[PDB]
Amino acid sequence: MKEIKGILESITGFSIPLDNGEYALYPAGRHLRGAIGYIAFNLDLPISSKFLDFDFDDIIFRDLLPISKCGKIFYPEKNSNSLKCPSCNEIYGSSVLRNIMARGLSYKEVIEGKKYRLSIIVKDEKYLNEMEAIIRYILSYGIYLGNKVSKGYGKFKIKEYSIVDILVLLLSDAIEKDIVFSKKEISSSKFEIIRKRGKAKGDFGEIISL
């Protein structure tokens, strides 16, 4: 199940609403899966159909946790959204969230130029082959995660990526917190905000050991 680990760089700042006034310091892998499925359907590819069901564990999309300055990745706090990396502290917190208003449009947004980790593990090898093609599309062109994406909010650019085979605390929340998503298909324009109750972090279902 060789994987691909890369460094996402925010050329433009992002914003992602977690509802009830909540916002995220880092983008979730659900957005990476959504954008990758959109450009796979733009490529008119087989992987698009694999993405089209919104239920395909063939490739596991991990969350785009921020790569720390000296630490590897910021680890979640118990019963909190604060992110702390092991090497030093670098508490991402709510500092990157800044309130903004746009001709009456009030909302919040994240500082660009902070690094983000990426890891997509493709079990099937043919899935890996289409993964390296759509990952070359992520490498040369850009990846877009968040809301007001078409305005440009959420531009992401790969710097350092290696296709490395991948060899407990839940790094990402696993389906009680409500990680809400939607399958907004191009043909099936039905928008389904599914509020999956699940265990939060600090304790794309994935876990990270010590």
Tell me which residues touch RNA (CB under 7 A).
16-19, 22, 30-31, 33-38, 40-41, 48, 51-52, 54, 100-105, 144-151, 154, 178-187, 191, 193
Q: Rounded to the nearest whole angstrom, what is the least distance from the CB of residue 167 to RNA in the complex? A: 27
**What is the C-alpha to C-alpha distance for residues 119 and 116, in angstroms, rounded to an integer?**
10
Q: Rounded to the nearest whole angstrom, what is the least distance from the CB of residue 107 to RNA in the complex? A: 8
**What is the C-alpha to C-alpha distance for residues 29 and 35, in angstroms, rounded to an integer?**
10
Residue 26 or 85 with smaller CB distance to RNA: 26
Residue 67 or 179 with smaller CB distance to RNA: 179
Q: Could you tell me which of 26, 11, 23, 22 has the C-alpha nearest to residue 68?
A: 26
Tally Cβ neighbours within 10 Å of residue 40: 21
Q: Rounded to the nearest whole angstrom, what is the least distance from the CB of residue 195 to RNA in the complex? A: 8
Q: Rounded to the nearest whole angstrom, what is the least distance from the CB of residue 188 to RNA in the complex? A: 8
Residue 11 or 102 with smaller CB distance to RNA: 102
What 148-152 contacts at long range (C-beta under 8 Å, 24+ apart), as own/partner pairs, is 148/15, 149/35, 152/12
Structural contact between residues 145 and 64, judged by C-beta atoms closer than 8 angstroms: yes
As a residue count, the chain comes to 210
Residue 110 or 179 with smaller CB distance to RNA: 179
